[PDB]
Amino acid sequence: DPREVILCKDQDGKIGLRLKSIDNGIFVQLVQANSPASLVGLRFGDQVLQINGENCAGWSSDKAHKVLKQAFGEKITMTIRDRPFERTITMHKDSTGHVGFIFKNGKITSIVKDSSAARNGLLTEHNICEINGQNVIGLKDSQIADILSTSGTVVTITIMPA
Amino acid sequence: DPREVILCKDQDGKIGLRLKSIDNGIFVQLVQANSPASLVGLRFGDQVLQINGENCAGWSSDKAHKVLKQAFGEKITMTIRDRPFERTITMHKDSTGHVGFIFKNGKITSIVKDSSAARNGLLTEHNICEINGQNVIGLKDSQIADILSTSGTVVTITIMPAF
Ligand SMILES: CC(C)[C@H](NC(=O)CCSc1ccc(Cl)cc1)C(=O)O
Ligand SMILES: CC(C)[C@H](NC(=O)CCSc1ccc(Cl)cc1)C(=O)O
């Protein structure tokens, strides 16, 4: 169910967005903290259907970025589909405080045998988006580990295919 | 979220299932019409978490198939997540009766400019699973076209990233 959003460019003329072309669509790759993008609810994995009423279908990442950069005025309109690839998985820490996965560059790379991750069908080649509702996009691997280590027993992660 | 299913092998010793290892999970790639698999509601894109209470995590396609083939007894339990990557998109036919995409082998390959498919952000490298609630997995491309051609103006398609 798409929604329309209005962004007002900041002091530098930016909205705080990086976009990526995938499967002839345009998706939010990065939302800068406290940016116009952040303040209208944009998140990693949001799909951009329209920029200023023009279809993004088949646009390169460069084209989407050029269109945003060239946009005359204070106001940019986007049609957004909320994180359509988003999946949430709930795991429980074992006696050693582990849920049972390895990751690199925010991307899950292996599932530990007979772990909570194994029982719950956690998948590799998926980016970690949130841990217990907290956004981890753009964090270093050691900061993601810090958040997992400081979690209670219940660990809910939001993932998306890389 | 997960559900348990019990299969019995048919007269030929088959359950009517092909499994595929993707991202260190196990997914249903094929369900044969009127198979034991079909009758317990297994579908293309279902995730298999457990076979006979053992985790499928990190299993090769071969291992999953060996485990099923060697399963002692008539009775096989599987823990299933229902088509977890399944997404629905609604489009409207234009004056020519088109929503605006090309597909081959049930996989969307291009989006037509200025179409309902374009406006609604339909994606390529996605398999068509259902049209207007009707399952099209296993149909020939001409049969998928037949269903789209006989649809009313509103076309709701269920898609999934391709294997
Ligand atoms: C942290 C969570 C996922 C923990 N897993 C592990 O410790 C294995 C390695 S992940 C990792 C990768 C890079 C850094 Cl810099 C730190 C850690 C668990 O299984 O519950
Ligand atoms: C059929 C529907 C999806 C129609 N799109 C097209 O006709 C382009 C060609 S797809 C196609 C591929 C194989 C067969 Cl055997 C038949 C058709 C629309 O855009 O509404």
Residue numbers in the entry:
A (entry chain B): 111 to 272
B (entry chain A): 111 to 273
From the article:
Syntenin is a small intracellular scaffold protein that contains two PSD‐95, Discs‐large, ZO‐1 (PDZ) domains that bind SDC, an N‐terminal domain that binds ALIX (via three LYPxL motifs), and a short C‐terminal domain regulating the conformation of the protein and accessibility of its domains (Baietti et al., 2012; Grootjans et al., 1997; Saito, Nishioka, Iwatsuki, Kumagai, & Sasaki, 1975). The PDZ domains of syntenin bind the C‐termini of the SDCs (Grootjans et al., 1997), but bind also to PIP2 (Zimmermann et al., 2002) and several other membrane proteins, including CD63 (Latysheva et al., 2006). In contrast, SDC‐syntenin‐ALIX binding regulates the formation of endosomal intraluminal vesicles and the secretion of CD63+ exosomes that contain syntenin, C‐terminal fragments of the SDCs (SDC‐CTFs) and potential SDC‐cargo such as ligand‐engaged receptors (Baietti et al., 2012). Since syntenin activity strictly depends on the functionality of its PDZ domains (Baietti et al., 2012; Grootjans et al., 1997; Grootjans, Reekmans, Ceulemans, & David, 2000; Koo et al., 2002; Lambaerts et al., 2012; Luyten et al., 2008; Meerschaert et al., 2007; Zimmermann et al., 2002; Zimmermann et al., 2005; Zimmermann et al., 2001), we aimed to develop syntenin PDZ inhibitors and investigate their potential utility to control cellular phenotypes as well as exosomal‐releases.
Molecular modelling studies, relying on the X‐ray structure of C58 and MOE/Pymol tools, suggested that addition of one carbon spacer in the compound structure could maintain both the canonical binding mode and, the face‐to‐face π‐stacking with Phe213, while slightly increasing the distance between the hydrophobic thioether‐chlorophenyl moiety and the polar protein backbone. Moreover, better torsion angles, closer to optimal geometry (60°), with favourable staggered conformation on the flexible carbohydrate moiety, were also anticipated for this C58 analogue. A new compound with one carbon spacer, further called SyntOFF, was synthesized in three steps from the commercial four‐chlorothiophenol. The small structural modification, consisting in the introduction of a single methylene group as a spacer, resulted in a > 10‐fold improvement of the affinity as compared to C58 (IC50 = 37 µM). SyntOFF reached the reference ligand efficiency (Hopkins, Groom, & Alex, 2004) threshold of 0.30 kcal/mol/atom, starting from the C58 moderate 0.24 kcal/mol/atom value, highlighting the optimal introduction of an additional one carbon spacer in the structure of the C58 (compare Figure 5b and 2b). SyntOFF accordingly inhibited the syntenin‐SDC2 interaction by 96% at 400 µM in HTRF, while the methyl ester intermediate and very close analogue cSyntOFF proved to be inactive. SyntOFF appeared selective for syntenin, not affecting Erbin‐P0071 or GRASP55‐JAM‐B complexes in HTRF. In BIAcore, using DMSO as vehicle, SyntOFF displayed a KD value of 130 µM for syntenin‐PDZ tandem plus C‐terminal domain.
